[PDB]
Write an enzyme that holds these catalytic residues in place. Structure first.
Site, PDB file in Angstrom:
ATOM      1  N   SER A 231      10.616  -9.401  14.171  1.00 50.61           N
ATOM      2  CA  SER A 231       9.739  -8.233  14.073  1.00 50.61           C
ATOM      3  C   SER A 231       8.361  -8.641  13.563  1.00 50.61           C
ATOM      4  O   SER A 231       7.355  -8.291  14.163  1.00 50.61           O
ATOM      5  CB  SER A 231      10.311  -7.124  13.207  1.00 50.61           C
ATOM      6  OG  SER A 231       9.404  -6.847  12.152  1.00 50.61           O
TER       7      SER A 231
ATOM      8  N   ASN B 104      13.797   4.332   5.381  1.00 46.54           N
ATOM      9  CA  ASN B 104      13.211   4.193   6.706  1.00 46.54           C
ATOM     10  C   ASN B 104      13.643   5.370   7.568  1.00 46.54           C
ATOM     11  O   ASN B 104      14.840   5.623   7.729  1.00 46.54           O
ATOM     12  CB  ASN B 104      13.618   2.868   7.346  1.00 46.54           C
ATOM     13  CG  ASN B 104      13.069   2.705   8.750  1.00 46.54           C
ATOM     14  OD1 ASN B 104      12.057   3.313   9.112  1.00 46.54           O
ATOM     15  ND2 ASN B 104      13.720   1.861   9.543  1.00 46.54           N
TER      16      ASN B 104
ATOM     17  N   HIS C  46       3.570   2.734  10.033  1.00 46.39           N
ATOM     18  CA  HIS C  46       5.016   2.698  10.192  1.00 46.39           C
ATOM     19  C   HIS C  46       5.631   1.977   8.999  1.00 46.39           C
ATOM     20  O   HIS C  46       5.215   0.870   8.649  1.00 46.39           O
ATOM     21  CB  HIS C  46       5.344   1.983  11.505  1.00 46.39           C
ATOM     22  CG  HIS C  46       6.803   1.764  11.745  1.00 46.39           C
ATOM     23  ND1 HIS C  46       7.771   2.667  11.362  1.00 46.39           N
ATOM     24  CD2 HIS C  46       7.457   0.742  12.348  1.00 46.39           C
ATOM     25  CE1 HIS C  46       8.961   2.208  11.712  1.00 46.39           C
ATOM     26  NE2 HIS C  46       8.797   1.042  12.314  1.00 46.39           N
TER      27      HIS C  46
ATOM     28  N   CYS D 138      11.140   3.249  16.934  1.00 49.00           N
ATOM     29  CA  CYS D 138      10.465   4.091  15.960  1.00 49.00           C
ATOM     30  C   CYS D 138       9.131   4.626  16.467  1.00 49.00           C
ATOM     31  O   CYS D 138       8.291   5.028  15.656  1.00 49.00           O
ATOM     32  CB  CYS D 138      10.261   3.323  14.647  1.00 49.00           C
ATOM     33  SG  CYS D 138      11.597   2.170  14.175  1.00 49.00           S
TER      34      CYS D 138
ATOM     35  N   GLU E  38      15.417   8.051  18.063  1.00 51.16           N
ATOM     36  CA  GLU E  38      16.162   6.947  18.641  1.00 51.16           C
ATOM     37  C   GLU E  38      17.660   7.059  18.392  1.00 51.16           C
ATOM     38  O   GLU E  38      18.417   6.246  18.931  1.00 51.16           O
ATOM     39  CB  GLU E  38      15.632   5.606  18.113  1.00 51.16           C
ATOM     40  CG  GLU E  38      16.096   5.199  16.739  1.00 51.16           C
ATOM     41  CD  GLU E  38      15.451   3.890  16.319  1.00 51.16           C
ATOM     42  OE1 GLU E  38      16.149   2.874  16.099  1.00 51.16           O
ATOM     43  OE2 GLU E  38      14.206   3.868  16.284  1.00 51.16           O
TER      44      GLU E  38
ATOM     45  N   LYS F 222       2.147  -6.058   3.549  1.00 48.55           N
ATOM     46  CA  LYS F 222       1.673  -7.143   4.399  1.00 48.55           C
ATOM     47  C   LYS F 222       0.905  -6.612   5.602  1.00 48.55           C
ATOM     48  O   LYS F 222      -0.110  -7.196   5.995  1.00 48.55           O
ATOM     49  CB  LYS F 222       2.821  -8.045   4.865  1.00 48.55           C
ATOM     50  CG  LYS F 222       3.843  -8.442   3.825  1.00 48.55           C
ATOM     51  CD  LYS F 222       4.763  -9.512   4.403  1.00 48.55           C
ATOM     52  CE  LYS F 222       5.911  -9.845   3.468  1.00 48.55           C
ATOM     53  NZ  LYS F 222       6.871 -10.805   4.097  1.00 48.55           N
TER      54      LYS F 222
ATOM     55  N   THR G  47      17.723  -0.895   3.790  1.00 42.76           N
ATOM     56  CA  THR G  47      16.572  -0.320   4.472  1.00 42.76           C
ATOM     57  C   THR G  47      16.921   0.929   5.287  1.00 42.76           C
ATOM     58  O   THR G  47      16.188   1.272   6.224  1.00 42.76           O
ATOM     59  CB  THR G  47      15.888  -1.379   5.349  1.00 42.76           C
ATOM     60  OG1 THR G  47      16.716  -1.715   6.475  1.00 42.76           O
ATOM     61  CG2 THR G  47      15.574  -2.619   4.538  1.00 42.76           C
TER      62      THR G  47
HETATM   63  C1  ACO Z   1      12.875  -2.347  12.815  1.00 45.13           C
HETATM   64  C2  ACO Z   1      11.378  -2.166  12.982  1.00 45.13           C
HETATM   65  O1  ACO Z   1      10.963  -1.349  13.742  1.00 45.13           O
HETATM   66  S1  ACO Z   1      10.210  -3.184  12.037  1.00 45.13           S
HETATM   67  C3  ACO Z   1      11.083  -4.445  11.055  1.00 45.13           C
HETATM   68  C4  ACO Z   1      11.859  -3.819   9.855  1.00 45.13           C
HETATM   69  N1  ACO Z   1      13.222  -4.360   9.964  1.00 45.13           N
HETATM   70  C5  ACO Z   1      14.420  -3.469   9.910  1.00 45.13           C
HETATM   71  O2  ACO Z   1      14.293  -2.313   9.766  1.00 45.13           O
HETATM   72  C6  ACO Z   1      15.841  -4.135  10.043  1.00 45.13           C
HETATM   73  C7  ACO Z   1      15.865  -5.405   9.184  1.00 45.13           C
HETATM   74  N2  ACO Z   1      16.365  -5.032   7.879  1.00 45.13           N
HETATM   75  C8  ACO Z   1      16.240  -5.894   6.703  1.00 45.13           C
HETATM   76  O3  ACO Z   1      16.695  -5.485   5.660  1.00 45.13           O
HETATM   77  C9  ACO Z   1      15.535  -7.290   6.825  1.00 45.13           C
HETATM   78  O4  ACO Z   1      16.369  -8.177   7.480  1.00 45.13           O
HETATM   79  C10 ACO Z   1      15.080  -7.883   5.455  1.00 45.13           C
HETATM   80  C11 ACO Z   1      14.265  -9.171   5.699  1.00 45.13           C
HETATM   81  C12 ACO Z   1      14.122  -6.868   4.731  1.00 45.13           C
HETATM   82  C13 ACO Z   1      16.283  -8.172   4.556  1.00 45.13           C
HETATM   83  O5  ACO Z   1      16.786  -9.445   4.706  1.00 45.13           O
HETATM   84  P1  ACO Z   1      16.719 -10.389   3.294  1.00 45.13           P
HETATM   85  O6  ACO Z   1      17.348 -11.748   3.481  1.00 45.13           O
HETATM   86  O7  ACO Z   1      17.381  -9.653   2.144  1.00 45.13           O
HETATM   87  O8  ACO Z   1      15.046 -10.550   2.973  1.00 45.13           O
HETATM   88  P2  ACO Z   1      14.394 -11.811   2.156  1.00 45.13           P
HETATM   89  O9  ACO Z   1      15.460 -12.794   1.749  1.00 45.13           O
HETATM   90  O10 ACO Z   1      13.382 -12.439   3.069  1.00 45.13           O
HETATM   91  O11 ACO Z   1      13.665 -11.153   0.791  1.00 45.13           O
HETATM   92  C14 ACO Z   1      12.877 -10.022   0.981  1.00 45.13           C
HETATM   93  C15 ACO Z   1      11.711 -10.006   0.011  1.00 45.13           C
HETATM   94  O12 ACO Z   1      12.139  -9.769  -1.194  1.00 45.13           O
HETATM   95  C16 ACO Z   1      11.720 -11.074  -2.136  1.00 45.13           C
HETATM   96  N3  ACO Z   1      12.749 -11.194  -3.107  1.00 45.13           N
HETATM   97  C17 ACO Z   1      13.959 -11.777  -2.975  1.00 45.13           C
HETATM   98  N4  ACO Z   1      14.620 -11.619  -4.138  1.00 45.13           N
HETATM   99  C18 ACO Z   1      13.824 -10.927  -4.980  1.00 45.13           C
HETATM  100  C19 ACO Z   1      13.983 -10.474  -6.282  1.00 45.13           C
HETATM  101  N5  ACO Z   1      15.030 -10.556  -7.295  1.00 45.13           N
HETATM  102  N6  ACO Z   1      13.010  -9.796  -6.885  1.00 45.13           N
HETATM  103  C20 ACO Z   1      11.841  -9.528  -6.219  1.00 45.13           C
HETATM  104  N7  ACO Z   1      11.684  -9.967  -4.950  1.00 45.13           N
HETATM  105  C21 ACO Z   1      12.675 -10.663  -4.337  1.00 45.13           C
HETATM  106  C22 ACO Z   1      11.603 -12.105  -1.289  1.00 45.13           C
HETATM  107  O13 ACO Z   1      10.676 -13.124  -1.811  1.00 45.13           O
HETATM  108  C23 ACO Z   1      10.967 -11.419  -0.063  1.00 45.13           C
HETATM  109  O14 ACO Z   1       9.697 -11.179  -0.318  1.00 45.13           O
HETATM  110  P3  ACO Z   1       8.524 -11.570   0.763  1.00 45.13           P
HETATM  111  O15 ACO Z   1       8.860 -11.060   2.108  1.00 45.13           O
HETATM  112  O16 ACO Z   1       7.187 -10.926   0.286  1.00 45.13           O
HETATM  113  O17 ACO Z   1       8.379 -13.120   0.822  1.00 45.13           O
END
Ligand code: ACO
Ligand code: ACO
Lengths: 449, 450
Positions: free
Chosen positions: B208, B325, B246, B116, B82, B255, B158
């Site tokens: 997503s 990733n 993936h 992807c 991509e 999950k 990521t």
């Molecule tokens: C793109 C595709 O083809 S598929 C989808 C994959 N997405 C991507 O590649 C692009 C998106 N990239 C990203 O980084 C995403 O936006 C995210 C959600 C992973 C990051 O955004 P964030 O605001 O930092 O995520 P969020 O606040 O929800 O916390 C992530 C996880 O870490 C947990 N967490 C937060 N702080 C902590 C901490 N100190 N210690 C342990 N866990 C923690 C959260 O509870 C959450 O866990 P959960 O999902 O099991 O409930």
């Protein structure tokens, strides 16, 4: 799983066009430099309302409608294109809202990309799917959609736009002779789009032809060597009824076929008549020098013209009146062959040449079978209705066509706008999809009819 | 053509990396938010010298040499990616300079593209070629190459980069269970690259999951519905030994599989005991739209799936947790981790594979592993891949040099006429690697080798 190939076709191109004599006058060209020089008569182009998504919709639906096809026996949908709307989300996904209210989501396929070759590559991927262990009895669907646009340089007259849909399935009027084909591909820089903001490619005009020729040679040679190991004979231009080529412009198709006759002389095939010593001054050339000798081109054209009128000229109608359709050009040229020879083509062999800069090329063979409606050569020519669509265009004056192309530059990769329907939505046909708006987040929304 | 599938693999990722613990501190993140929250340990990334062309060269050459395969027994070459370097000239053509010193130009294939998923689409296209009437007895070759990069926001952790090569041919240790599969595809705007100047994607919050779930549901459902018409029985978590996903980040893999166990509960599978039917049933009053949004049903699903997860997917996590990733290559680095960690085991097992690309495109398909004869055997692949030694050969960046590199990449993305700074960086490349030297006044790209 027998004789799988093209079961159906339909074609869509914008009705907005400019005529080339009118465009010779507008720009600074000697008379005949477009009509005779490039061999082109009319240039179709997308207005602000149409794009590769839009044209894809029109071609898809119209094939499903007129051939009375259930959207749910589509097992694979693949798109060939070189127009980049989005760099990650493919055209195929956009097309999936034709199948949303149909519940059909178990369809394979994505975009295939390399210049004007992706459409052919998708077609090849699709046939191999029907003959695959992974098949599920459903139809394949192939889309070729492109908008060919260049800067105000000498390549703008060679533009075009169109979309083609093809239904792939077994027991076809258009069967693939799977093993009679030859591919050639290398890393060359003859034409490519390295400026990601611009919809315009850099073209190395000289080398476009030179690369096209090297590939057309190697493809023909590999094809001939597989004809030799399958049916014992040498292959010649007389072992095929029609030749259809990628058609970026007409004069390139002229030379490309004449070049096939030159390749027959260096192997002394049954296609070279004895009056045809006219070649012999050029047998002291290596194949590197052959490509550049402007007389060997000019000589090959002379004795192949009678062959050209019989085996290539029917393949010229739509490319000569729409322009260069990139991935879809070869299949609009084949569509021209169906429209003007549907009543005759039963039993015939048609050899097809596909090219994309980069470069990727494949020459493959089709043998036509008579079949039964709706999947019959006679009904395809009826449904395509090439005559009525050409008859239903509107020409722009050469100065308003240039104004459209400057509006498209600012709408390419553009954010947050609504398209201007003034007067233009009037001239597209009743039932066509068109672009309505793209929001602050680049999401695109289309209307119909 | 018979028992067709993967005969060989090799993987390349940049040796320059960041550790996510070190980057939690740097980005001002809660402790554990990257190591445990996202489940990632180390993030690989391309320097100015590496890109998807470079990585493709390394993976292709290293596969042909280490497996001693003749470049003239390649009949088809396809690239799934991509990362757009050029909008018309494909990565596949770039790869053809590996075949000119061979005269082999009669290769089919071009680039396949959709987020992807393009790598999976190429693999499937390639499988269907060997089984096609158009086959010619030669090997198919599939490439998955990507550089996952984001702006400095919550998605930069990521990131990743890698390229994977796979040799397709008959009578393979990794055969395709051709009819046991399910696909789902829709038009969604969950993630896409609409700004042609920037290499960074747009992401629409947690869409997503909403999409990834609908696809993972529909794909699993379609596969189960094909298992009943093939072998009479229902399909469950237990009718496969390993599940590979993936892997954009590790916590989504947790999950995703936990979500598969929920789909087994809603179908009364043989995999759900009374301890699980108990814990799930407070949650069967949900519609499937609400299930997607229930932050409570997720965590319950992960708890009842933990032992299954520890046995059937945790080995599929090594490379993704230590590289990041890899987009189109994400699923296959995870599968590479499974071969590396259980090659001595993998004979006779069934491995189910799930691929997703935003847009969206999805397919869940099944592989059966055969022990076969070297060099095309699971034990020799793990030997040739040597993922353990590749990981030991990394060089760690301090978190501010990683950030300095990543805004340098923004300055080189879609840029012309420059020469790269090899001093000190080329030191870090292994002997043999390809690298970019310069891009000239016409955007043409030139690569070198050690
Ligand atoms: C793109 C595709 O083809 S598929 C989808 C994959 N997405 C991507 O590649 C692009 C998106 N990239 C990203 O980084 C995403 O936006 C995210 C959600 C992973 C990051 O955004 P964030 O605001 O930092 O995520 P969020 O606040 O929800 O916390 C992530 C996880 O870490 C947990 N967490 C937060 N702080 C902590 C901490 N100190 N210690 C342990 N866990 C923690 C959260 O509870 C959450 O866990 P959960 O999902 O099991 O409930
Ligand atoms: C996959 C593919 O190959 S398609 C994508 C790659 N190819 C492209 O994009 C098309 C590139 N765009 C172009 O405009 C073409 O390169 C070109 C050759 C037409 C360049 O434009 P020009 O500067 O006009 O080139 P050129 O001077 O050679 O004119 C072309 C032809 O018109 C002829 N010609 C020129 N003026 C006239 C005239 N008044 N009357 C009749 N013929 C004329 C020339 O003799 C020449 O024909 P020839 O090859 O038989 O000798």
């Amino acid at each position: 799983a027998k004789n799988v190939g093209i079961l159906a076709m339909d074609i869509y191109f914008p009705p907005t066009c400019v005529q080339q004599e009118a465009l010779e006058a507008h720009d600074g060209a000697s008379k005949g430099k477009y009509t005779i020089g490039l061999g082109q008569d009319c240039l179709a182009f997308c207005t602000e309302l149409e794009d590769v998504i839009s044209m894809s919709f029109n071609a898809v639906t119209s094939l499903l409608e007129k051939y009375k096809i259930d959207p749910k026996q589509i097992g694979r949908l693949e798109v060939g294109s070189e127009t980049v709307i989005d760099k990650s989300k493919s055209i195929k996904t956009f097309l999936m809202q034709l199948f949303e209210k149909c519940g059909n989501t178990d369809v394979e396929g994505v975009d295939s990309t390399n210049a004007c070759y992706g459409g052919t590559a998708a077609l090849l991927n699709c046939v191999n799917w029907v003959e695959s262990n992974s098949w599920d009895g459903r139809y394949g669907l192939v889309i070729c959609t492109d908008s060919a646009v260049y800067a105000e340089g000498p390549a703008r007259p060679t533009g075009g736009a169109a979309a083609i849909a093809m239904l792939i399935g077994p027991d076809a009027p258009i069967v693939f002779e799977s093993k009679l084909r030859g591919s050639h591909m290398a890393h060359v820089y003859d034409f490519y789009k390295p400026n990601l903001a611009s919809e315009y490619p850099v073209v190395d005009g000289k080398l476009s032809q030179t690369c096209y020729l090297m590939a057309l040679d190697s493809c023909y040679k590999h094809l001939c060597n597989k004809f030799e190991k399958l049916e014992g004979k040498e292959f010649s231009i007389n072992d095929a009824d029609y030749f259809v080529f990628h058609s970026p412009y007409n004069k390139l198709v002229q030379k490309s076929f004449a070049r096939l006759l030159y390749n027959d002389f260096l192997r002394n095939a049954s296609s070279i008549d004895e009056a045809a010593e006219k070649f012999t001054p050029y047998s002291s050339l290596s194949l590197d020098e052959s490509y550049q000798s402007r007389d060997l081109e000019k000589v090959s054209q002379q004795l192949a013209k009678t062959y050209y009128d019989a085996k290539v000229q029917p393949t010229t109608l739509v490319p000569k009146q729409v322009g260069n359709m990139y991935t879809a050009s070869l299949y609009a040229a084949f569509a021209s062959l169906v429209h003007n020879k549907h009543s005759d083509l039963a039993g015939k062999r048609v050899v097809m040449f596909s090219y994309g800069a980069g470069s990727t090329a494949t020459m493959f063979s089709l043998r036509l079978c008579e079949n039964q409606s709706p999947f019959s050569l006679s009904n395809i020519a009826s449904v395509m209705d090439v005559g009525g669509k050409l008859k239903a265009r509107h020409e722009y004056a050469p100065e308003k066509f240039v104004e459209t192309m400057k509006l498209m530059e600012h709408r390419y990769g553009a954010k947050e706008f609504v398209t201007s329907k003034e007067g233009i939505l009037d001239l597209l046909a009743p039932g066509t999809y068109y672009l309505k708006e793209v929001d602050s987040l680049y999401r695109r929304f289309y209307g119909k009819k």
